[PDB]
């Protein structure tokens, strides 16, 4: 109805056709999209809502979609997962307070926040040992290292999800060795590549410094850990290390990649993650893993079928045919002579000819193709009009035999 312009008639307006369409949410379950399988199933589960009811996302889930606020306060449409619902609850109970009220509320609600992060969100509370909520000040160095490995090393692929996270863990082990060493000594982790099997490196480090296995973190090392959790030249840590004024930043930063990398989420659970999807477009996102070619060809072929039926009598012989389709901006024997004042556009329009064929492209296409690159049309630059140029065309009516000859004064 938007292609034909009839969409506006219901509003008592003249038809207003449009030039094209874009489909975002619709192709989020395409076979070639990197979205994780469980995320594709969650997207498909979203039933959607008709346009007249979409605005019921600011207040509650509708069609599986809700509206939450980003770091800057901009609205975002996301799937109403457990993590997103926690996001919304925090938006309306913590983040909307004034700066002076924020800290006491975090202190008063600390246990609830920690439980909710550990249960529902893609960034859990870091200081949690065997299900028991703690604080960095109440964990041993071995426990910190083990939690780092648990949250940063992927066992399925047996690798560190990000090399920067391996650098983080290696730096922490290096600070452990610094704290419990008693004199000049060689570091046990000479290269961070030794962390590629983290358990062995941890066992080595904490065998050489057994005291660190039953001693809580030094206050100076708590500060160091939290400072290196803020290193801009590193991927944001996948956890919340502390509750303080920066809790919103710790909670919301880097929130979109987890849906395509569920192997690096706590339990490979989509419900912890954040997925962007539209309330109204969700009504058509049903079939999982349908190739993008199929989805786009389906839309285009439906348009062609409807147009054929409505405006061509279901007769494809009615369709006009050109040699090639494209290159059109939205805005038998001849002789041509160039001058200083000749305008380039009309000169090239005359040289190209009225029919769409090789001559047309030769004289009107703005770019040609190299091995894979696009470069300015050499033919046009060679035929750029200037005083003295004389162009002779013969057989312009039979493209297969047309010959365009350019003559210029040489030696008189």
């Amino acid at each position: 109805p938007y292609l034909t312009g009839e969409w506006s008639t219901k509003f008592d307006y003249p038809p207003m056709p449009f030039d094209g369409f874009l489909f975002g949410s619709r192709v989020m379950i395409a076979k070639e999209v990197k979205t994780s399988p469980d995320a594709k199933k969650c997207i498909a589960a979203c039933t959607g809502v008709p346009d007249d009811k979409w605005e019921q996302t600011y207040k509650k889930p509708t069609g599986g979609i809700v509206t939450v606020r980003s770091e800057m306060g901009e609205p975002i449409h996301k799937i109403a997962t457990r993590g997103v619902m926690l996001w919304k609850e925090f938006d309306e109970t913590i983040f909307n307070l004034p700066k002076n009220k924020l800290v006491p509320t975090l202190e008063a609600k600390r246990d609830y926040i920690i439980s909710r992060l550990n249960a529902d969100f893609q960034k859990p509370w870091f200081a949690t040992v065997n299900g028991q909520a703690r604080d960095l000040a109440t964990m041993t160095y071995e426990e910190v290292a083990k939690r780092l490995v648990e949250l940063m090393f992927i066992r399925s692929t047996n690798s560190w999800f990000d090399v920067t996270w391996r650098t983080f863990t290696g730096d922490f082990l290096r600070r452990v060795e610094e704290r419990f060493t008693k004199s000049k000594t060689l570091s046990l982790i000479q290269s961070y590549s030794l962390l590629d099997k983290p358990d062995e490196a941890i066992e080595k480090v904490f065998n050489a410094y057994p005291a660190a296995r039953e001693q809580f973190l030094n206050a100076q090392d708590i500060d160091h850990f939290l400072s290196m959790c803020q290193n801009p030249m590193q991927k944001p840590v996948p956890f919340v290390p502390v509750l303080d004024r920066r809790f919103e930043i710790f909670f919301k930063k880097d929130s979109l990649w987890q849906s395509e990398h569920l192997e690096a989420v706590v339990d490979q659970d989509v419900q912890r993650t954040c997925i962007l999807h539209g309330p109204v477009a969700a009504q058509f996102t049903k079939v999982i893993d349908e190739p993008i070619k199929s989805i786009m060809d389906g839309i285009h072929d439906g348009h062609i079928k409807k147009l054929l039926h409505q405006y061509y009598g279901d007769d494809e012989s009615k369709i006009p045919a050109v040699e090639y389709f494209g290159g059109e901006s939205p805005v038998d024997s001849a002789v041509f002579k160039a001058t200083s004042s000749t305008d380039e556009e009309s000169w090239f329009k005359a040289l190209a000819g009225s029919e769409i064929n090789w001559r047309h492209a030769s004289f009107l296409c703005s770019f040609i193709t190299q091995d894979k690159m696009f470069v300015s049309n050499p033919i046009r630059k060679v035929f750029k009009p200037s005083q003295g140029m004389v162009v002779e065309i013969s057989n312009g009516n039979t493209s297969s035999k047309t010959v365009v000859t350019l003559s210029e004064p040489v030696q008189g």
């Binding site: 610094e178 004199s183 570091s187």
Partner: protein
């Protein structure tokens, strides 16, 4: 054709008494003692401290027993005497650790001795009386 070494950082310990396995502890006192004493009439010291010419109990013990400070003792004396202070934040790069109290320059635990031990020893213990400490 075109190693990494680790420096020590001070880790001050409280030095609670070492508790040994019950078997060894039982081998010390007479076997008849079990149940013999009214433990509500036995007095025990559970904590102690001091402020003296050599700082706390820890630093005074180190000077009394060994005649010299360890890295922990030197760092504690530097902190007590105000030579060094703790900093955590921007210093442009982010820094967490000790800094010089007068110049705010960073200080590593390894360098604390070389920077401050002569001053620490010169201004501790029995020494010439300093009018600045006793109202002129």
């Amino acid at each position: 054709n075109g190693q990494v070494e680790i420096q020590p950082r001070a880790n001050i310990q409280l030095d609670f008494p070492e508790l040994k396995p019950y078997k060894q502890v039982k081998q010390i006192a007479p076997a008849e003692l079990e149940g013999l004493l009214d433990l509500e009439r036995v007095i025990v010291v559970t904590g102690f401290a001091e402020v003296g010419p050599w700082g706390s109990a820890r630093t005074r013990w180190e000077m009394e027993a060994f005649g010299e400070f360890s890295l922990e003792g030197c760092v504690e004396m530097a902190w007590i005497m105000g030579f060094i202070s703790y900093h955590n934040g921007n210093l442009g790069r982010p820094y967490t650790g000790w800094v010089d109290s007068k110049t705010k320059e960073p200080v590593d635990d390894k360098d604390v001795k070389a920077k401050y031990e002569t001053s620490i020893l010169e201004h501790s213990g029995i020494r010439l009386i300093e009018p600045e400490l006793f109202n002129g």
